[PDB]
Design a binder for this molecule. Sequence first.
Ligand code: CDL
Ligand code: LMT
Ligand code: LMT
Lengths: 226, 160, 52, 112, 82, 108, 63
Amino acid sequence: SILGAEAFPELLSKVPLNPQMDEDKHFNKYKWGNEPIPVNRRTGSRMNSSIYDNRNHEAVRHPWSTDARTFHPNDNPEADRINTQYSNMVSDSFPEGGFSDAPRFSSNWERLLAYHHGLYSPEKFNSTTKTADEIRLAVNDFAAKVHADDPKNACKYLMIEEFKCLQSAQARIDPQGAATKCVKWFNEWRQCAWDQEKMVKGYNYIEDRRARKHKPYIGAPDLQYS
Amino acid sequence: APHQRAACEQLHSEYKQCLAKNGRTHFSACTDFHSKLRACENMLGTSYCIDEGINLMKCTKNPDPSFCAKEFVAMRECNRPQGPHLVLSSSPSSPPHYELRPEVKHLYNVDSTDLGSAVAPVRSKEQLDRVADSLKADLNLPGYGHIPYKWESLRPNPGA
Amino acid sequence: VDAREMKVDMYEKLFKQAADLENPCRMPGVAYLRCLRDTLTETQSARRSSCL
Amino acid sequence: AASTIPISQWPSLLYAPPSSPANPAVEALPEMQFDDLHYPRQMLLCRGAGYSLEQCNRMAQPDARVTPENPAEKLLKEEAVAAIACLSQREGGKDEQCRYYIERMYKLANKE
Amino acid sequence: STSPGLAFANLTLLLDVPQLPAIWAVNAWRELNGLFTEMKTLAGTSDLLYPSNRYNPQNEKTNRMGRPRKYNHGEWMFGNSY
Amino acid sequence: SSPHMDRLLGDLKLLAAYDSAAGWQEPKAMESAFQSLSWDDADVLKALPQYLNCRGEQKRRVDFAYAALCPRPVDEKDPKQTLMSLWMKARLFSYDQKHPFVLSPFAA
Amino acid sequence: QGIKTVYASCRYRKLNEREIISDRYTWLHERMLEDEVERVLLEQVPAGGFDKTRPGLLLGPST
Ligand SMILES: CCCCCCCCCCCCCCCCCC(=O)OC[C@H](COP(=O)([O-])OCC(O)COP(=O)([O-])OC[C@@H](COC(=O)CCCCCCCCCCCCCCCCC)OC(=O)CCCCCCCCCCCCCCCCC)OC(=O)CCCCCCCCCCCCCCCCC
Ligand SMILES: CCCCCCCCCCCCO[C@@H]1O[C@H](CO)[C@@H](O[C@H]2O[C@H](CO)[C@@H](O)[C@H](O)[C@H]2O)[C@H](O)[C@H]1O
Ligand SMILES: CCCCCCCCCCCCO[C@@H]1O[C@H](CO)[C@@H](O[C@H]2O[C@H](CO)[C@@H](O)[C@H](O)[C@H]2O)[C@H](O)[C@H]1O
């Protein structure tokens, strides 16, 4: 009795699940070959990024022992990146399988203390990257909930966009890096909140008369702005 | 006296209705109701903000440089059900102060009941210097006033 | 009616600060308060049948 | 030709992906949903109503708010069944043995 | 007369001196609108009018930004809520 | 001795391969997958017309499972994708009508 | 321009006064509505007030 007879059609019919498998098993059904994803991009550890940090490009220090070999983003990518899907794009900034800095705690109180001091979250350390489908599902659920909360709100799509950008930047495993990208939509939402409030509660101000040189040149048109 | 309580509540509603119908410009027409409302107050231990509203109306047509702020806050604090939380201390002192009732001190983020003067300070070189020195002492920054380069001139402060 | 609007606004502000979008009861609470806003100019007897 | 997509253009890449031989319905990508809170919320609501765990599990039903169904499965029913029969008989359509049905379906769906 | 070196001035003149009547007309229209606004203000208004502002939609049932007034269904003892 | 499990896992692998080959622009590989996608299963063939006419709780269970496995909406114009989706749904329908699914975490 | 500027200065002074008073009246209106709501709420307080020593809802044992 053999194990898994009808379960390896990929092997029976030389069907590669990816160019890496194609190159390995020598099926040669990918016309464009394969450019291997190097190990520094397949795995690695979290690193400091800012140039205004002294330990820049150095691995992040944790209470537990950690391999300090870092994930290197793709800084000099090739001109042709035939697969421009999220699957192949995410590997340039994160490792699909997650970082290699996860702990195996010898006890429960060590885990407790790390969490209590803000140095561990399983959501952040024991996890992979999110697939495009998962990101879209989360975004659409959040959008439905926001619409149900209030349809006649102006900052709705702004909140949805900051959520979307966090999910796309993988804030679960890179919260600081993702906030660095989403704080702009947060700020726009703040502005829209003030604007909606001032439109609801009539808030206006006495505008001063028009300046003597409002137009730089007499022949120039003074486009009227509300 | 629940009958009397209901009667006076109806009277107060009628007074409000007449005052709204007349407007805050013509408010001297509804003086008829004071006779009964003051008796209501003296009987039921209740208040109705009569003098406060009248003073506010009178002031907002001939306003004060303060723009009737004290009248506004007085009316706002008097219309409260359980009584005013914030008051203006009656004092022989020249500058009056804003005081907070003790029974409501636990609702406000304060150490004492004195919330400061009810008028802004007067411009004074001495007070400015005092505040600046206090801030410098609290900061304790070695490097304040240091001038690495100054335009060479017979004048001590070139420009300024 | 103005005081009813104010009371409903207070309820909504309090409940929205209390319950976040991840909370399950947020949508039902907001829906009930929206029904109240819709039925302000009514009596409790007529509002119950609609908001129950 | 296919240039790198920076990390700032990924939100638009998710809802407007590039063209591929097997594209999704971009107009329907905002409609793909799969609620992870369905059964927890159902149980919470029922237990708050006052039912027991067994009653809740008997009354539970799968989520209907999922990704909509393809209208082709109802419009091109007969053609799809015929194509599947052809495939089952001809080993998956090797060396273009179901081109007939596949092209009929493609024409019906595309119309030039 | 003219010359190639005067192309700047020729173009500027040809395109601008015909606009001076329209500029003067715009100025006169602005003056008349200001006059009418001031006459209306003198006549009287429920809510104030901002003179140098583009549009003033405020009335008894409309905020100073075009939205309905909140808490305006009933009546108030001190009169208008504004 | 485990044909259902084997063919399920194989079909999943082939769907993944089709998606990858589409992303990498490989018609040869994706057609190889489509051809290898187990079209000669009598049980699924017999359940196909049953699924095409089912309705109600069974259909909702099967659609929930198919959204769990393949939530992305296929293009309404690609007959190959449509057919692979139909085949996977028919397989799930056969498994369900033999032994129904229990999708709730709460159960006993 | 000087005549217009004098007239505008007077008008702007009056307008500033009116705007301040109007905003403060709006503030007062809102605060009075809040006071009415509070007066109606205080009727729902049980006789003797609240028992601020214990929790309103006891939602578990203490063994
Ligand atoms: C040969 C021609 C004639 C030569 C002589 C001309 C110079 C006459 C002036 C002499 C006075 C100099 C003062 C000396 C005391 C020290 C102060 C000082 O010097 O600092 C000034 C300055 C440095 O200042 P600083 O470092 O910034 O520090 C303090 C500030 O200066 C000052 O502090 P502040 O910033 O707070 O002050 C601000 C404000 C203070 O002042 C003011 O506010 C107003 C001052 C203006 C007063 C106007 C007059 C008032 C009139 C009232 C009456 C009106 C009615 C009657 C008149 C009617 C008129 C018709 O502005 C000024 O400072 C004005 C200063 C002007 C400097 C002199 C400019 C001339 C440069 C040299 C020109 C060389 C020409 C070619 C030579 C050719 C030789 C081959 O240094 C110089 O000016 C150097 C002067 C050198 C003279 C050289 C003469 C030629 C010698 C050739 C040697 C060969 C080698 C040379 C190399 C090239 C070879 C080819
Ligand atoms: C010891 C003797 C002292 C003599 C004192 C003489 C005092 C003379 C004071 C005149 C001051 C006029 O000041 C100037 O006038 C014009 C109109 O008149 C104003 O108005 C001008 O600018 C403002 C906007 O910029 C608008 O009103 C308008 O666009 C224009 O008319 C200017 O805003 C003001 O800066
Ligand atoms: C027969 C009508 C009168 C014919 C003569 C018209 C001459 C008008 C040109 C004078 C210069 C006007 O230049 C500028 O335009 C208008 C006034 O016109 C003013 O504009 C400002 O005050 C006017 C009040 O009238 C407001 O309507 C306007 O919202 C405000 O921006 C500026 O303060 C002034 O600096």
